[PDB]
Symmetry: C3
Subunit: 254 residues, 3 copies
């Protein structure tokens, strides 16, 4: 039995919005301590791990863990009915064949009850997170969003390279080149909105932009994206939430 | 001879905007007491009846009734030249081969004179309005607009059913279900913006959404759409105007 | 050697925006006194001549004249990286194989360095400007923009005709007709925003709208477009700049 309600329906949509570089389809494991999901690129090159905690909801109740396999595209659509930011409630039962979605308005007071036919897919769950990453850095999602979108113009292949206190975003296609090169630093100034690099190694990794754009789509979710990168491993892009995160592991080329 | 001028050109466009689920083509019967038109779906399943009264214009003059058969799509385009909301004048003569359209600005004072080649089509005019409808109801266009657009996601086939003081909008496609269920009621409160049901029978009618969306397009014209529904008959959706209406008769499935 | 920096990057984009009815490709001759370019329709019917002066830049330095042949579409894209209105710097060297573009923010202080592979195209440069034009007129770009876009609906062929103190923009396709007829005049009133006709002859010229729309795209650049027209010759549409212009010579039909 499950009753999970976001105060602000806007949220769950945004989260679901971070698929679509995900395989139209996904399992939503609903434990006692919230929800997690796992989607993978059709060619197994990007992985989206989601985690939403109890404190992220307005109210949450899961009596016994239940796994909600569903078709994203489909669930995506139902979320359109959602006038975003008022009171999506998710619901399921002892044995679930469909998940129920209750949008609402509290004091305009119009409630609609949509159900989605549950898919039931086979769940090979992955734990590829490394402990140590050659480099970690975290800049504000919004900036990264441009740097991605901007380089994505020139090249199909965006190269990220970190040198001592120097991060270099370099795209080089056949039409031309471009490079964004930015300090860490920290202004004691605005708010956070600063650049944070802790380096253990140099790195020279290069990723398909097509994916980067699909990653940075979840730029809306956080203020600040944390990137981790290592040679023999993939890169981890992390957007943070009230008491959970959305994260994209994306394999580098070569 | 005809000289018909809307003060606000915005209007006539909006009205013409309620075709397009109409057959690119239509007769515009211009009597002494205003204009009426009649379009039908290519497959004869939707009917759009328009009526615009004298009081709806800023000025109107028809010396002898005249029938203006014209190509909507074409006339639609000329209306684009219209900076909406300033002084469309329609014009025609004793025997008409083209209708003239004079857009203007009163005190910016730029006038443009467009003519449209009159089509001349054969006019089987229909009077299928029943006297008694099993149920009448009227809610605010804007709400209905969502309920239509929203259910239109899940199903291709939206079912409207009225039970004693309970209207149920139910869409059930193969991807999932959805149901919007709303009271009548009346708040003595805001303005009108209330829900009005007078029931004589239960009804369980189901219509193609594809059409419903084409009907609710004319949501802009009124504040409040009046729906009438009966079993052996079609449904009548009515948007109201200064001294006239636009209305869609749409046949139910089965 | 070249260092050319617009204070407001917005500008150079807008200028480049006035191609696309230009052959994806163009030479940019960078003299000591600024830049000029010349593009032509693939079928040689429209010509775009650009001239940007020193005073139009924030700073400009050309040590010896250099010619920058480049692919518009490509250069167009790099300009997207430009958050329009902050500090595009163009750069090239003694012998140039690529032009470098430095976007910036002055006190947000994020700099990106893009290079574009220089094309090298063969330069047949044209000087078809007549001295005397049967008629000159200049109205505000914005008005002309509508009159073009509006007539462009009815016809494929827009006819401009100037009679004594009467300019007549007439489109007549097969769907219908339209005519915009406007006085010169002058209100000593608003600002400029007046209509200016000096006539030496009648004219009855007719141009492809498809092009007119491509011409009036550069409506953003000036407030006021100057049109010149002569029978045996093409028409000259001129948009004006800080210390230069963009201009379209377009041949009339027949």
């Amino acid at each position: 039995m499950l009753e999970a309600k976001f105060e602000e329906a806007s949220l769950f949509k945004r989260i679901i919005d971070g698929f679509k570089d995900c395989v139209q389809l996904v399992n939503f494991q609903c434990k006692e301590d919230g929800i997690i999901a796992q989607a993978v690129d059709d060619s197994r090159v990007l992985l989206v791990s989601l985690e939403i905690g109890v404190e992220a909801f307005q109210e949450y109740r899961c009596d016994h863990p239940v796994t909600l396999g569903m078709d994203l595209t489909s669930l995506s659509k139902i979320l359109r009915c959602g006038n975003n930011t008022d009171t999506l409630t998710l619901i399921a039962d002892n044995t679930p064949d469909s998940i129920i979605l209750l949008f609402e308005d509290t004091k305009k007071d119009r409630i609609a009850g949509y159900s989605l036919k549950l898919m039931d897919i086979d769940a090979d769950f992955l734990k590829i997170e490394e402990l140590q990453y050659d480099s970690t850095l975290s800049l504000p999602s919004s900036e990264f969003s441009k740097i991605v979108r901007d380089l994505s113009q020139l090249s199909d292949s965006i190269n990220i390279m970190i040198t001592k206190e120097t991060i270099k975003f370099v795209a080089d296609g056949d039409i031309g080149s471009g490079s964004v090169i930015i300090k860490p630093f920290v202004d004691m100034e605005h708010p956070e909105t600063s650049i944070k690099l802790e380096m253990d190694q140099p790195v020279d990794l290069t990723f398909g932009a097509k994916y980067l754009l699909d990653i940075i789509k979840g730029s809306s979710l956080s203020d600040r994206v944390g990137i981790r990168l290592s040679s023999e491993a993939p890169a981890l892009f992390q957007f943070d939430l009230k008491s959970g995160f959305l994260q994209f592991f994306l394999a580098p080329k070569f």
